[PDB]
RNA sequence: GCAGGCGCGCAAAUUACCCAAUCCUAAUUCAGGGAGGUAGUGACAAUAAAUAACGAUACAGGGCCCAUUCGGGUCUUGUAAUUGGAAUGAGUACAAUGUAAAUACCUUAACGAGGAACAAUUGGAGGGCAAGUCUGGUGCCAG
């Protein structure tokens, strides 16, 4: 189950990477993309100029959280709903929160970069 | 130009004499040291050998081998400049001679 | 060499310059063998030959091969690595196999000696 | 107690020959012992320890089977005739021995090659 | 065998500690040769996945693929979908090695002692001894290990030291 | 390559002596 | 003077010694023959070295199509039979499913003739007629109605010819090379260019048709009277899916 | 009178550190280190143990009360 | 060409066996074949395993481990070579198979373990100790 945020998005469509086969071809396994209202309030207000990081958002395979705090700060959201459970896989590419993520122990983290994604801290990679 | 001495990642050097015999103070890096003649250039320069102790193997014209040193910090009593340490002396390694595997030949 | 006597072994290490040295495989190395070459390393190396002998060890060959395979490590070890020796086998009338004995003497008609400076 | 099997019994008379894939399997014995097997072989057939022969066994891995190739036929004349001499030589019906080895005989050969001449010689 | 890309990551050296601890391994290359045709089996089964269904190349290759790990026994047949193929792991392909397999038959009392008696050729599956720990018994020779005929714990004569100490006390 | 070569060529490197 | 690079269809292993059996000079091309060695050794084993198919060949004992020919790399090729008198057996060797050499067992009365296409035909000297067909027999005095791409019927006792074979619409056809080799069945149109690429056309149950160029084709003969019995069951080699099917069916 | 040589000679890994018997099979330290990482997390975390062993007669360990171990949601 | 070597005073397969196989050549089943095959050497790569497994007893609890801030949790902790029988293969070797003959593998009598001494190495990180040495100087310190 991989939380997806903004900034990933936005630099998957800017790389062209597509999101549920990027994510098959990065970590051979079905995925769950996971988008919390709380990040898809952040990707609305990103205004006119990523409506298709929105229409590729709203997609029914990214069935998506519910979350429940007053304004729409995702990185702490994202940072609390994981370190709740650890069951979640973060999809990222923000500088501070992978140094947020690479400091609580033990989630698996993946950005894109070259083209196709890239996964950190998870074992069975291969 | 890929390496300290030309190209190549050792050189047999000729030993002058043993730099820093007379320095009080044990394992220091001035009593560590020793002049060497490059051969492939000809020309005089200074190098380590590691534990002063097995400092006293080498000691004058033993054709030995000389291989880079890599400062991986800052060390307090080291000296910059050199970059040579020695790996062999007359063909035998001097490490193994430190912990007395093998034995110098003549 | 007169083998009882480091009266004798110390001047011989003294003179000489090629050294065929005799190990004998069924019984492994000896220290006689190893002070001589302990003299000859710090007195300055001459050109040393293994040789070993008595190779009638069993019907074991694989004895055979797997002590032969220990004595040359240990040689090379401790003489320079990949010295040259040769495994005679038992002595046939009088004398060892020809066929071993010429190698033996092409090598030390090819020897091509070196420098020592005492 | 051991039990001897044949499998796939293919005639060839261009031979006079009977092949086949030969299994012993011997439960606790070491290894079933060419001749002995080959004689029991021979009983269970018509006839002819010596011409029967039984050459290309293995025993497989942990013990207990061994698998080979085994042939029989009659008539051990033609069994000197139609079998090679280093089986012959495996059983007590032939014998050959050279001495000189491949250097021999090849200088041998050469000094011969170096003679040209009959025996003559003087002095 | 294959290298991982980033080895020395503390959560795969704890993943290594892991599974070499509770399966009973020698070192991380037999976790590695098994991740290895994992890898490969799982990315031999994704792209049959991406094509389409009912392409004659997916059913047939799909279904040669199931067969295969149904047969194997990492693939229980309740689930014969390809895409449970995606879903497996390497838990599951340690867990049918023999070692593993015969300690949890019953009859060896600890893994490092299942692999150990393996090792001393004591355990044949049903025919063959077989002196080595990674086999990946199928699911058909699961019910086939005992003790091997030709061993002590068989029922064979009794061992080296059983006889001599029995000579000891004959003195 | 020079790789292979510009490192065994030291081994035709002594000390100077005479015979 | 060597070998290994053999025609695959030889099923030879990789690991049995680097060299191959090189086929001597014989009636056929090297590409499409076997030699008397790979048959005797390892295609049928009767024998299990090159010493004993030796034996075997000088023992008098084989009879290439009429004759003896004590020769292990012997290229008796495609179309010939071997008798052996022990073994009861005639080998009519031709083509398969799949490519390689199918054995026949052949009686007697199929074993007394071959037959051949002709691969040239002009008038040899003294004004004697001449025929040669694809194993070097060059024969004299044909019947006077003679076509090039034509099969005869060759007596193979005494080398004559005892029966002749017209080709054109609605007659066999068994085709020797191509993709699409070892198969039968000639019933779609006659189509000729010049300069090749051209084939009498394949049937099939399904009206499938292969086109080759003409050399490699070639008559075996008419519907319901072919002249050699023919291997597996009159192969065409339909589907491995449809045989899945037929399996699944009946 | 035949001499010999002995072990040292024989052997010439002399001059070494104190090595280790539980490193010279290197299954047995991945078996011996994985015994303690069992118990190390004793002391991290409290893992399930089997259950209620013999009759309940008390945790027999402590119990204390201004402490909770539950994680809160932000 | 094959084997061995040399050309530096600093270096590395054996001057082994055989036509038995695969073929080739010839007056031609046979003879020849350093073509080719086998063996030895060969940390050049690749595959699989061992270097121990199971207990019993006695004690020490001021006990261990995880915590960047005096926090948390656990005999279900450690040492005693206290100690016991089982199992084996490295090695050994009757033999037999293997192969042209032999070696190797597989199989196997009788042997063969306790420090299983039948004695795993390469690195890396740290301390601590003297009636001891050396240097600096605001005692007794620092290096
Ligand atoms: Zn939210």
New interface residues.
Partial sequence: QVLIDTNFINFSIQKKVDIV?GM??CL???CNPLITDCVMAELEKLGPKYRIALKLARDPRIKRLSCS?KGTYAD?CLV?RV??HKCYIVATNDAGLKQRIRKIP?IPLMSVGGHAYVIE?????? | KSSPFGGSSHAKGIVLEKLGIESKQPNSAIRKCVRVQLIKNGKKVTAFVPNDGCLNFVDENDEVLLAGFGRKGKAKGDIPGVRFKVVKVSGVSLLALWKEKKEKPR | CPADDLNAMIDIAKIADLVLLLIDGNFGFEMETMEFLNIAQHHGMPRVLGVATHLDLFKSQSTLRASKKRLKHRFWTEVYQGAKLFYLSGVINGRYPDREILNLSRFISVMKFRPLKW | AVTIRTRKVISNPLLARKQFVVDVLHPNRANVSKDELREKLAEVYKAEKDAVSVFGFRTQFGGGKSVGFGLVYNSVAEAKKFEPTYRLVRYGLAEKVEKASRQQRKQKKNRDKKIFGTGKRLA | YSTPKRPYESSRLDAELKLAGEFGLKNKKEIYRISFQLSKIRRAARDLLTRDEKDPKRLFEGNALIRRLVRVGVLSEDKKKLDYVLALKVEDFLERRLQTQVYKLGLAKSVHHARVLITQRHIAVGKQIVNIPSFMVRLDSEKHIDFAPTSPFGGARPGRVARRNAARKAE | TMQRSSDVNERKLHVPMVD | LKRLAAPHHWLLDKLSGCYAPRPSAGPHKLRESLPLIVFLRNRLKYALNGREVKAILMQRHVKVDGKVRTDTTYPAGFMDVITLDATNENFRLVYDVKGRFAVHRITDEEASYKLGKVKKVQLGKKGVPYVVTHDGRTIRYPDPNIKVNDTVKIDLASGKITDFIKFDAGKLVYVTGGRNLGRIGTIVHKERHDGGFDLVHIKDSLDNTFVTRLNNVFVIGEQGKPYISLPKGKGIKLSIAEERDRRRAQ | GKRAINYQILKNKGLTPKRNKDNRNSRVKKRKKYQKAQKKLKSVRAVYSGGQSGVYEGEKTGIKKGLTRSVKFK
Avoid at chain 1, 121 to 126: E, G, H, I, N, S
């Fill in positions: 086969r098959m071809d051979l396994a079905k705090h702490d609390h370190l709740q033990g801290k998870l074992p069975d990679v291969f």
